[PDB]
Design an enzyme around this catalytic site. Structure first.
Site, PDB file in Angstrom:
ATOM      1  N   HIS A   1      -7.337   0.494  -6.684  1.00  0.00           N
ATOM      2  CA  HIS A   1      -7.678  -0.139  -5.420  1.00  0.00           C
ATOM      3  C   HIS A   1      -8.478  -1.383  -5.405  1.00  0.00           C
ATOM      4  O   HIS A   1      -9.824  -1.568  -5.247  1.00  0.00           O
ATOM      5  CB  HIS A   1      -8.581   0.957  -4.786  1.00  0.00           C
TER       6      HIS A   1
ATOM      7  N   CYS B   1     -17.194   3.354   1.328  1.00  0.00           N
ATOM      8  CA  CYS B   1     -15.915   2.428   1.536  1.00  0.00           C
ATOM      9  C   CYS B   1     -15.319   2.663   3.218  1.00  0.00           C
ATOM     10  O   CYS B   1     -14.653   2.115   3.479  1.00  0.00           O
ATOM     11  CB  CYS B   1     -14.811   2.723   0.623  1.00  0.00           C
TER      12      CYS B   1
ATOM     13  N   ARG C   1     -14.005  -6.742   3.401  1.00  0.00           N
ATOM     14  CA  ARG C   1     -12.415  -6.529   2.925  1.00  0.00           C
ATOM     15  C   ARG C   1     -11.848  -7.679   3.221  1.00  0.00           C
ATOM     16  O   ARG C   1     -10.852  -8.393   2.421  1.00  0.00           O
ATOM     17  CB  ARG C   1     -12.060  -5.273   3.801  1.00  0.00           C
TER      18      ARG C   1
ATOM     19  N   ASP D   1     -18.691   8.233  -0.650  1.00  0.00           N
ATOM     20  CA  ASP D   1     -17.087   8.500  -0.035  1.00  0.00           C
ATOM     21  C   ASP D   1     -16.895   9.896   0.435  1.00  0.00           C
ATOM     22  O   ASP D   1     -17.756  10.992  -0.010  1.00  0.00           O
ATOM     23  CB  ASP D   1     -16.186   8.121  -1.018  1.00  0.00           C
TER      24      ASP D   1
ATOM     25  N   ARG E   1       0.821  -1.119  -0.026  1.00  0.00           N
ATOM     26  CA  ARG E   1       0.223   0.043  -0.143  1.00  0.00           C
ATOM     27  C   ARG E   1       0.850   1.324   0.063  1.00  0.00           C
ATOM     28  O   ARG E   1       1.653   1.565   0.928  1.00  0.00           O
ATOM     29  CB  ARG E   1      -0.952  -0.010   1.152  1.00  0.00           C
TER      30      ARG E   1
ATOM     31  N   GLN F   1     -10.461  -3.453  -2.367  1.00  0.00           N
ATOM     32  CA  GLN F   1     -11.760  -2.468  -2.046  1.00  0.00           C
ATOM     33  C   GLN F   1     -13.057  -3.115  -3.232  1.00  0.00           C
ATOM     34  O   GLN F   1     -13.975  -3.451  -2.854  1.00  0.00           O
ATOM     35  CB  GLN F   1     -11.577  -1.094  -2.223  1.00  0.00           C
TER      36      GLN F   1
END
Ligand code: NI
Ligand code: NI
Lengths: 341, 341, 341, 341, 341, 341
Positions: F138, F276, F321, F234, F111, F141
């Site tokens: 991503h 998210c 996740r 988001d 990451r 996700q």
């Protein structure tokens, strides 16, 4: 009556001079054995169920990763205690902490400045302590390095290892001392200002006179490199180190380039290059870019040509960090039967 | 390039003659080391993930239990194949079966009459084969027995072990050869009719010339027993045997009673009693009661008084079946690092 | 129909006052049993396969270590999430964090300032939550501490534990309440300025009525120390604390020295010393050296003499952090059969 | 809602005709995959924690050993219930036993005479049942056999497998049916008396017409053998079987010898020999000796020359018993994700 | 100082009368809890790393299976030693065998005729010994049985369990005593010739005085069945039993049929049927067919109708053999914390 | 010859564009399959014995917890290296570090900001590398999100997902491309200033032409929201961002309130809310309170009413996740048999 036999069990590994040639070679050979086991998928959980503390007063992530992966393969669980987590002798005495660490954990890794801290840990914890790097000694790097030499050549005694660059940094000091114990010839090729100290040379000379190792300390490349089986180097400078330019100035003639590799006169099948890492061998880093923009310097202690050439063993050497630490922890904590070295 | 070092790894254990004194001592000491570990609950799953075949041509449940528990302690799973399960060489050749067994199992125990079957198993299976008892050799019993001797006395060389009774039964044969290899003095005290064969004697003699063991085969009780650190015996007659009455009659003068223990001349702290078991030391069995009615015998090779005395180590010796088998399996199959015996 | 029986299972441990004396003793006794198990190498992976989140708003490494090694002994894997990793209620609500945490992990340790954060975690996460230290409560420390008392004495009820010094420090407050619940007599010997608050005194008085515990709060050394089975202390001053010189001067007479032990009247076989650590008992710290230079002070809350004497149980008590946490996590998450407490 | 997807999970494997070509090939390929995993030391404990019952009404030790070693590698524990341990439908109904077996064990292997017993077990146990051999079907042998063919040739469809000898024994019946499903040409080369039944030929013909397999049933060697990629055989007679001499008389022209291997006209790199074992290929057995002393017969269904020649794959085939049973148990009980075949 | 607390640990379970109602209920409740655990996939390897010997003097496969699967769920490895493997007191005294067994294995199951063998095993082995069935007692069956009753009803005390048929069979005898200890009312409905003995009646009467259990022994169906919560039966006749026709004729009126259930008076939500199995409830056995041909008998102690009805709990009760044995082995060998029963 | 078949084994997961719809669906379905397994306590230790490196250039504790718990459930041990531990390309090249990491660890999570660093990690490490978040992609996700969509609706193709708010943040970019690949209709509803870039749009368009996905980018709330099965949002502003007030002002009309949920026209059983996380849905945070004083905002991208409504699936999406990461790791590193996607 206790019928357990193991000459390593419970012992700490703080300084490579505390171990005989026979003990060092055992651990090296044990490492090569466990490397073979791991490649083949053969289980070796000799530390099944154990807890291990990994103390780092300064961040040393490659060493951490070697200790971590090694612990897991052996069945032990490692916990990382870094600089924000632990400060030995600061607000609690090192001795008090040792005792509490020792009462919970089965083994302790210690990376920090003071050798004296390592010793108190070893004296008071009641469990094996392993020195992951102090100002004075780097035993785990030495185990990896000579494992790598033996992996390539098959027999350490009478081989020649040449360190080029800063002959006063603690890896060169350890190489000189450890090579002397093992019967490996050691050349230190440095500027005079950076020759090893008299104290270091004396420790090495003492061991060499009993092993038959030849030790050469020189600022002459051609004298130093001739006959080398290993050419080894390390960084000239740190992150914003003092006397930066002066160090670079004096060190630049001692760069390992392809000419240096040629100066050995050693046949291709009897010569390797080593570097404990990280290496400044190109400009693929933020630091690398900055140094170039300021000095036009593109490589330092080793050229990219050598780093990527057929002589290169630094990646095998860095993997061996793990295999060698694994043998060390297993000899010392796994309650294996080892009646004799 | 294989950097694995282990002098035992992959070897079969078919005959105690096939091992040097140093190799035998290693395995004995390893057994004592592992006995300590298990007592302490220290893990030693050296055979993690493995499968082991335990073959028995005849029931042998103490040997089986020892291999079974040893396998589990090591992380291996044993499967028992007895007389109704497997009949080596009956309908399929031992070679053919050995190849199939070896392709599925990591190791094979074999208990049966023919040494040749054990050898074929070892030759063709491609895995370690361990002899749980043949007509010719009993090496696991020998490891357990000399482990027991060392557990009590330390130093094996120079001690004296005396087997009393049928000097031709296969345990006596094994003890003579094995003591000879290890430098333990061996006395066989038996009727003339039951002296070990010339072959057994001459095999032992060859080992004794090199080890320094003193071998004595005699019918004289007082000459036999004198100087003994161990008095060892075994059953006189087995499974409604032929020449039954004659065997008992020639044998009874060689019973292990307290008076025999006293004829050694040996002090209480240098003297033990051993017996590979089962023992007929009382009337506590169906067989025992029948023998009392027919013969007036209430005890045979050893009296209940010796069996329950301060000298008795037979129950320790029997637990040691397990620990010694574990050392054997571990050294031979665990892929342990053992560079030198 | 759920036939599972366990009074602790699924419950959070946030405050010692939330459990009855029966429940606290069970946990304590469970800890001493598990300690015995670990010493014998007896397996107890009651949390096999579980994940545990360890949250620390502030560095607390001894607590972190106890939880880590406990988790591993139980078969669960702990992950440390410290100050740079988590800030509850800063960016994201503690409730939202609790839910997500609870969806991935099987239990949650929380060390932080606010008790309300511990409560939100317990309320919203759906998993057992364990308070590793808040401004209000230190339950795991109380478990370690009374486990230590019982380890030395047996029956807790009717014993006398005396805390000396800052009677307003959260250890002293927890001891007063917990000793009250348990029927241990608690003496707080402190300068009047540092007496427990009326709120703390009133909570402990409620519990003591039912338990028969005798609570004494006094600035008189001779009256406070008299009849003590345990003399317990803790630091007078923390890292760069305000009112430093005021605190040190008022607390100086309450130093635990040999005279303080002698003042108890208690026979050697009924007297122990305890300190939750770290202790300032010598000059073997950077901090200790700065205090010696500035103030001539060589020891604070306890003399080295008492610290290294036959009364000392700090290190046992410190080890007991681990064993007590293991019992607490085991009862609460292990799905053990516990029909009655 | 149940989101688990696996077209094999919970299914029994009683008869190879209950599976499509795609399902059979999947399990074959899965077996070759797990064989690779096991050679490399890659863990695959898909049945971790499970209990498995291995029922044998008649002793079938090679099949037992395959099921046993397979279970262990997958992390399941096998218990052997043989003929003295279990008699289905004798004193308790097969259905009652199935239910109780199913309530304790996670999977059941069944080897016995009646296919109907296998079906009741499958119907009433609530767990996967695997047929280890009945009078009607031998699915595990078939999985091993075609795995072995694919291991050597890489692609089953349009290959030719020739069985020689008793075309009425249940392995030949299974080979004919299974080859038909898989699109492999099958030749049965038998005396007319031992041609497969019309019922068997019809089942095979039905499947072959959809796969495009060619099936030849002949007593002519030269017609039968031509074009074979596999020559396969099995024993002519049992232990003191009825019409022993008559069977031997009619079968002896169908021996696989080197001439038979030549009759195929197949190049060396496209031809193998198979035999489900045990094989009478020499006189290395008690039975072998007896047959010779009575008839002068030295080899039966295969010559030693062929058995030990470069065509031989019977040992790889016997190892594959295990690898194929492993894939079968894993597909069927490991809760693996298998959305599609 | 041993701080381990467990009232069951190390204890043998040889006879149900040797435990108090508190102890028996704990085991029962422990079994229902562990059943819940297993259904949820919750780990409970309380016997991790242990070896268990399972001795069976006579074949008893349902018991063998319960012990095997229980052992494995707990992390211990069971080895089966059956009639061809062991004969206690035949060749070797049971005492000698016990000692050796106890030295290798961590617990011992014994099923055999003589209670005295169970006692010698418990006395001399040094490990927990569990009685899997003797001539005198069947404890594991009683645990399964009352676990089953509680599973259906909750509070055991004040319930009524009625055994019908051979009131002299050892199941009926065990139920009378165990129901007596537990405060369950026990009715034995049997022809007078098959009433429990005066010795059995007197043992149960002693326990019932203290428990308040109402014991009724009668040949009257209507008086015996009245108020029953459980109707329990077992076989009238065994394998080639003497007095076959006598036994069948006298027991025929005591068949558990729907009329027998109706005779209880008990509402559907308070009535269950139980049978320790195997049951003769149909003609789906070789034995059942021979009885139908010879005698026209189609069902004996229970009709298929009752066997397959809403009252039937045999199969749950049979599964419960496993869960109850697991609790018993777990309490007795798991080193679990159990301070109070 | 390698007979291992797995289309995912050894592959890195750096970008969702690098995977076909069938490969993405497989991983989603595998995630749902594994979620079921974990719920049921069915073991799936596919990465038994492995070590995994989790690199984070910036704190990302929810992503970390998901990788951590997933690793443990799979049998692998994760070690976290954050911003103070590792700085890829700062002083050592990413290539050099990648080689060392790969020689010790079996898999690497990364990451960080640069996709190029993820690519170098994949190119040089020799192990699977998983992108936990870069500036550009991503993928974990996305696996969690479409797993969540399928968990609620089944069939993905033909559904409609609408992202509302900043149409240029990297989650919106990812959703557009990924929905396009999977055949899910995607609406981005945003201010014109925050429409996804031409590049993002054109990448998505290329996938949508083949899948049949309808893509809509619009500033019209009512055109955007109509027909939506999912409303996804988001945070508007991040880490004291620049152009703060302008972003909120252009963004607020795009808040997710109940009135937005109603504009979809979609019935309660075909409509969910996703986010998210972290979400600013109340005042329960330090950040939230500051924003209330400065701006009068008590909620931003989503109101507390929508966040706590019947539509909310964000907490399920967040647990997912973990399950989706587990499927990814398992397929890519578990050496599972996967012949066809
Ligand atoms: Ni960890
Ligand atoms: Ni087994």
């Amino acid at each position: 009556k206790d019928f357990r036999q193991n000459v390593f069990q419970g012992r700490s590994v703080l300084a490579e001079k505390d171990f005989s040639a026979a003990e060092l070679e055992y651990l090296i050979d044990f490492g090569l054995h466990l490397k073979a086991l791991k490649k083949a998928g053969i289980p070796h959980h000799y530390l099944e169920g154990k807890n291990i503390a990994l103390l780092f007063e300064k961040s040393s992530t490659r060493t951490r990763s070697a200790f971590t992966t090694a612990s897991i393969d052996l069945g032990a669980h490692p916990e990382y205690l870094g600089q924000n987590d632990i400060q030995l002798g600061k607000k609690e005495s090192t001795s008090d902490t040792a005792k509490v660490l020792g009462s919970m954990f089965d083994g302790i890794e210690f990376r920090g400045f003071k050798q004296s801290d390592a010793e108190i840990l070893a004296r008071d914890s009641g469990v094996p302590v392993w020195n992951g790097l102090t100002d004075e000694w780097h035993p785990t790097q030495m185990l990896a390095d000579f494992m790598t030499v033996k992996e390539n050549f098959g027999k350490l005694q009478g081989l020649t290892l040449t360190f080029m660059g800063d002959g006063r940094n603690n890896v060169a000091n350890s190489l000189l001392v450890t090579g002397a114990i093992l019967g490996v010839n050691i050349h230190i090729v440095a500027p005079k200002a950076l020759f090893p100290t008299e104290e270091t040379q004396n420790i090495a000379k003492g061991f060499a006179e009993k092993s038959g190792a030849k030790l050469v300390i020189t600022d002459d490349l051609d004298e130093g490199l001739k006959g080398s089986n290993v050419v080894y180097t390390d960084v000239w400078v740190s992150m914003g180190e003092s006397n930066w330019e002066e160090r670079v100035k004096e060190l630049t003639p001692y760069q390992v380039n392809m000419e240096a590799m040629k100066k050995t006169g050693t046949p291709d099948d009897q010569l390797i290059f080593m570097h404990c890492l990280p290496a400044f061998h190109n400009t693929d880093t933020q630091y690398g870019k900055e140094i170039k923009e300021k000095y036009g310097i593109t490589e330092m202690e080793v050229t990219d040509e050598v780093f990527t050439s057929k002589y290169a063993r630094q990646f095998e050497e860095a993997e061996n960090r793990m295999h060698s630490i694994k043998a060390m922890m297993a000899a010392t904590l796994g309650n294996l039967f080892i009646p004799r070295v």
